[PDB]
RNA sequence: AAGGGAGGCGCGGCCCUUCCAAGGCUAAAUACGCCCCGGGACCGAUAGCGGACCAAGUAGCGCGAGCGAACGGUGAAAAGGACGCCCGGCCGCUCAAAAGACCUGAACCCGGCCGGCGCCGGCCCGCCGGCCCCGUCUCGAAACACGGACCGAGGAGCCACGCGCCGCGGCGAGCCCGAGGGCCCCGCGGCGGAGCGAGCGCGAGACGCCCCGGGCCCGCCGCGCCCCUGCGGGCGUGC
């Protein structure tokens, strides 16, 4: 709303906050980003390291759905099991009726190892594992599995 | 035309207006620049003291 | 508690349970925020023409001819400036102004629910402007079931006690005060009751009445519930409308009504109660302040400092 | 004239009232401000100041952080002037009593299903206005992503990342990269 | 010292002449 | 040229995957002035189109290409002004009213009658006291620095998009009126959730009301030692 703005509080002041000595002119520094290596060098080095130059290999066309790679940690695995069933599985730490969790159905590929699991056997099927995700899973009685 | 080259006339008054600041209390104890052979032995000693050790 | 239900003639005929949408907290801040954004979404754009002021040919004469430097038409007439007669605006209006505003779906449902809860108070309906001094219940439910002649529909509104609110609206029609009467907004009337209906034909017999509006219960409008952005409208529910309120809120998928809270009536009660008062402990006695005055003036003033009198009075 | 400049500093501005238009916040703050003036307890004084804060100074608290902090003192009332959310990475919750400004729908369901209680600040006001057997708690005020870019990336003692995308090398490969 | 991220917006083309590059949505309800 | 074309880095070889150029037709969903029709938090006669006025791209200007104005309003009814007296005036008639060439009719400026001889302050009142020309650039303006005879009306930080930070509302490991389909109902991306590395790729728990620091864990660079599926795994050390 125009009626609550700072600029309407300057009616009657000859110069709307821009000063008498300097004033308000068109483009006293130039337009846009120009000057970054000469007269704005003090600005560009203080706040934008690595703005100038080249770095690394280039790919003329990236395949966005090849490089896509979702991930899930082991501390998030038991929340994929619906709440109505988690209690019973913990109740009976079965080796012969352990829960099977296939994480690609939920849309993940690799399993990483942050966190910890409850003391309960469980089977996890995925496309790739990290080394300590496997280590913490075998510590619990679980098995990792690879799936198509 | 020529303009003035240099003065420090008002600069001690600007330096004093917000007080003369002091460095952070934690800069006096920064490990930066101490001997590495002393900073290695410092970590080793504490890790094997049950009153100080923080291993799980 | 149960609401009462009246026949189309005025006696008590039935009882229905309170729908849960009336227990939502009263939020005049949320109703004002939503009413503001959704009343901006009905606007029609306006703008000046893009050629206006720039169809003529004009150029500066320059210095040396004892005249100001603005562009001039052949002959020397001022042109092409906001300070010249016939020139363009300094910054012309454009239709790319953002005319609409966005509101989340959760906050749109809160505003309807808070505006409906305000309608269940006889003290907020009165303070909104309506005449409800001869009304059986302010959650007013009435059994009509089919109304086609305006004459019969006028008879019900009398048979209950909302007759004075529609005459309040009828006797108020007038020509408005400004330029608005050249722009198809020549008359103004005050706003009366809102009839909300579900399965019965009532619209034909109610619509012609001054200051009356019609809402099918499945789609309730916030600009109707809070005219002027003031919440407490008087609402005449048909029986089938009032008895489908909970079904309607069950039809909103993955939605729960907001949590009920306490009022300043409830807070003022607690503080005046023995569980809170028993923690109270009094302040020290406060400093005592006089004005200065010369002790040496009199015997009594001086004696206040030294009673013995070794000190001379004067 | 009078010299009131030397040895004297400029006065300070702090929030002495909430600026929310929510009527439930004004009612509670005005109520706890009253109890402080008739008690002088410093629990009701810190709690009165928490209710004036600006929602970036009131971060959330998760159940797993509370379960961790309230361990070994599980018979006490946690008092939080913010929202309590849920942490699904914790499989089992303990029984506790929490009083908060707001609970998530899923956090309320879990707290109650363990035997716990979800109090409101007006339940707290009625039963325990001066904070007996209560602990005040808060979350990590410096957890926001915005507060991670404050400063001068590019200066040799910064440890802060820049803001946009920077695709070059100059000044970005360590000292002696300019 | 101003610490902003550089805007990645392209300058407007053909604003006062050329083909009309502004598409409005006032006809959307119709 | 004869089987050929393509697979986001060139050349030569071997495969695989997937298509058949150098000929042709084809509705729908999409875009838009003039002109007609409806609507508006738009303008209200120096505004809004240049153009609201029986005759505007007109009158007028230029060899020509071309340039291009100004001017809206009596009253309910024309009832648009009787009779008389002097030789245009007077008197007076119509009308609620002259509103009489026309609604209202401000300022600057002026003519007749009547009164008197700059701002502030005290006193009833012409005395005493104080008072340089404003706006502007400027170290510095009453300046022999510039603009300004007077008066009226108009006359200059608005809007769109992108970026940063702050405040408030709703919901919260989640969140979300895309487009579209049936102020109401349904509605994908996306962003957040994990980082680091040029890349092959590998991938975080240990403490803490909060804040600050310490310690440790993940990646990148280096390096002891032991081993299975091996320039691969494990366990360590250092900036
Ligand atoms: K300024
Ligand atoms: K300057
Ligand atoms: K310039
Ligand atoms: K420039
Ligand atoms: K540059
Ligand atoms: K290169
Ligand atoms: K032109
Ligand atoms: K000029
Ligand atoms: K000039
Ligand atoms: K929503
Ligand atoms: K709504
Ligand atoms: K930056
Ligand atoms: K290839
Ligand atoms: K290509
Ligand atoms: K290629
Ligand atoms: K004109
Ligand atoms: K000047
Ligand atoms: K100058
Ligand atoms: K000068
Ligand atoms: K001057
Ligand atoms: K002079
Ligand atoms: K002079
Ligand atoms: K000057
Ligand atoms: K001069
Ligand atoms: K002058
Ligand atoms: K590397
Ligand atoms: Mg000023
Ligand atoms: Mg001025
Ligand atoms: Mg300047
Ligand atoms: Mg200068
Ligand atoms: Mg200037
Ligand atoms: Mg200082
Ligand atoms: Mg000129
Ligand atoms: Mg104009
Ligand atoms: Mg007016
Ligand atoms: Mg064709
Ligand atoms: Mg005009
Ligand atoms: Mg006149
Ligand atoms: Mg100059
Ligand atoms: Mg000059
Ligand atoms: Mg002059
Ligand atoms: Mg004016």
UniProtKB/TrEMBL annotation, chain A:
Biased composition (Basic residues): 1-14
Parts forming coiled coils: none
GO cellular component: a single term: cytosolic large ribosomal subunit
Domain Large ribosomal subunit protein uL15/eL18, first and last residues per copy: 71-143
Segments of this protein annotated with the region Disordered: 1-40
Keywords, ordered alphabetically: Ribonucleoprotein, Ribosomal protein
Keyword presence, Ribonucleoprotein: yes
Cited InterPro entries: Ribosomal_uL15 (IPR030878), Ribosomal_uL15/eL18 (IPR021131), Ribosomal_uL15/eL18_sf (IPR036227), Ribosomal_uL15_CS (IPR001196)
Pfam families: Ribosomal_L27A
Alphabetical list of HAMAP family matching this protein: Ribosomal_uL15 (MF_01341)
Protein name as annotated: Ribosomal protein L27a
Species the sequence originates in: Giardia intestinalis (strain ATCC 50803 / WB clone C6)
UniProtKB/TrEMBL annotation, chain B:
One protein family per Pfam: Ribosomal_L29e
Keywords per UniProt: Metal-binding, Ribonucleoprotein, Ribosomal protein
InterPro entries: Ribosomal_eL29
Binding locations of Mg(2+): 19
Taxonomy, superkingdom: Eukaryota
Cellular compartments per GO CC: cytosolic large ribosomal subunit
Name under which the protein is recorded: 60S ribosomal protein L29
Taxonomic source organism: Giardia intestinalis (strain ATCC 50803 / WB clone C6) (Giardia lamblia)
Organism phylogeny: Eukaryota, Metamonada, Diplomonadida, Hexamitidae, Giardiinae
TrEMBL record, chain C:
Biological process per Gene Ontology, one example term: translation
Gene3D superfamilies referenced in this protein's UniProt entry, alphabetically: 3.40.1370.10
Assigned GO CC terms: cytosolic large ribosomal subunit
GO molecular function: RNA binding; structural constituent of ribosome
Keyword field: Metal-binding, Ribonucleoprotein, Ribosomal protein
Domain Large ribosomal subunit protein uL4 C-terminal positions: 253-308
Tree of life domain: Eukaryota
Residues that coordinate or bind Mg(2+): 70
Keyword Transferase: no
Keyword flag Hydrolase: no
Matching Pfam families: Ribos_L4_asso_C, Ribosomal_L4
Stated family: Belongs to the universal ribosomal protein uL4 family.
Name assigned to this protein: Large ribosomal subunit protein uL4
Species per Swiss-Prot/TrEMBL record: Giardia intestinalis (strain ATCC 50803 / WB clone C6)
Lineage: Eukaryota, Metamonada, Diplomonadida, Hexamitidae, Giardiinae
UniProtKB/TrEMBL annotation, chain D:
Cellular component terms per the entry's GO annotation: cytosolic large ribosomal subunit
InterPro entries listed in its UniProt record: Ribosomal_eL18 (IPR000039), Ribosomal_eL18/eL18-A/B/_CS (IPR021132), Ribosomal_uL15/eL18 (IPR021131), Ribosomal_uL15/eL18_sf (IPR036227)
Basic residues: bias regions: 158-178
Gene Ontology terms: biological process: translation
Ranges where the record places region Disordered: 1-20, 152-178
SUPFAM superfamilies linked: Ribosomal proteins L15p and L18e (SSF52080)
Pfam families from the UniProt entry: Ribosomal_L18 (PF17135)
Signal peptide residues on this chain, from the entry's feature table: none
Keyword Disulfide bond found: no
Entry's Gene Ontology molecular function annotations: RNA binding; structural constituent of ribosome
Keywords: Ribonucleoprotein, Ribosomal protein
Annotated PANTHER family: 60S RIBOSOMAL PROTEIN L18 (PTHR10934), LARGE RIBOSOMAL SUBUNIT PROTEIN EL18 (PTHR10934:SF2)
Similarity section: Belongs to the eukaryotic ribosomal protein eL18 family.
Protein name from the UniProt record: Ribosomal protein L18
Lineage, broadest ranks: Eukaryota, Metamonada, Diplomonadida, Hexamitidae, Giardiinae
